[PDB]
Amino acid sequence: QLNPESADLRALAKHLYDSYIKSFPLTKAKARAILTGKTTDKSPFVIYDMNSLMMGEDKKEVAIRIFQGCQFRSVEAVQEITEYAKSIPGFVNLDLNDQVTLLKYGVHEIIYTMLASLMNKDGVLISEGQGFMTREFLKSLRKPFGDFMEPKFEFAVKFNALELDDSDLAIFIAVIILSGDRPGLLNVKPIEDIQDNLLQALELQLKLNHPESSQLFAKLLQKMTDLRQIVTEHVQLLQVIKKTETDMSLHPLLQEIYKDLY
């Protein structure tokens, strides 16, 4: 069981973890420390209704400008994910167009994976950890805004119950990136060869790190299914928005908060 092949998979897991820590300053451990009130370094202010929203002032249709703004604020995350992908052995040797295709689909799913770290069943961290926007306040907002985030909370609560740590997430994210079923991929085999090795490393990592969870490997692969559906649901959201006839005004502070989400 402990042999050259398994040692190689442990070495790959460590390599990915080390690159993950270098690429992503916002780790899961840091987020959970804030959410469970462990960090006394300026604890986050809770925004739970319109009154606390205004007490919280510490921050071209409305919805479209929200999406423009969150996509612009996500540039740094996209750059971090791309930097991480360069560290995945074999990735930069793929055809450049396939590297771009892999990242152009993978980044959204990874952003949602990392957004889950900022979420619990009560709400989500915002303003670089200075605020906490409640789930039910978001859900209470007028259509179509009230439905924006709830499916991501539903995903995040289930995902977080797997209790993955940053060591786990490093490999999971690499597996997402090396998805050979992306539309428009030219050379699928060298991608699947890498992903197969990453999947072996993930299997071993979950066995060593999660004695409590039988079928965790399968459960985590099912989460990749839920991430894609969250991304594709954005196409439906855009159609809902265009067909909305009712007032879509939104408090400027709520627009700014939504630009911090995804």
Binding site: Q79, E83, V100, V107
Partner: peptide, 11 residues
């Protein structure tokens, strides 16, 4: 816009 960002980051 996204593809451009990724291509520049890959340089």
């Amino acid at each position: 816009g996204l593809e451009d960002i990724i291509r520049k980051a890959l340089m």
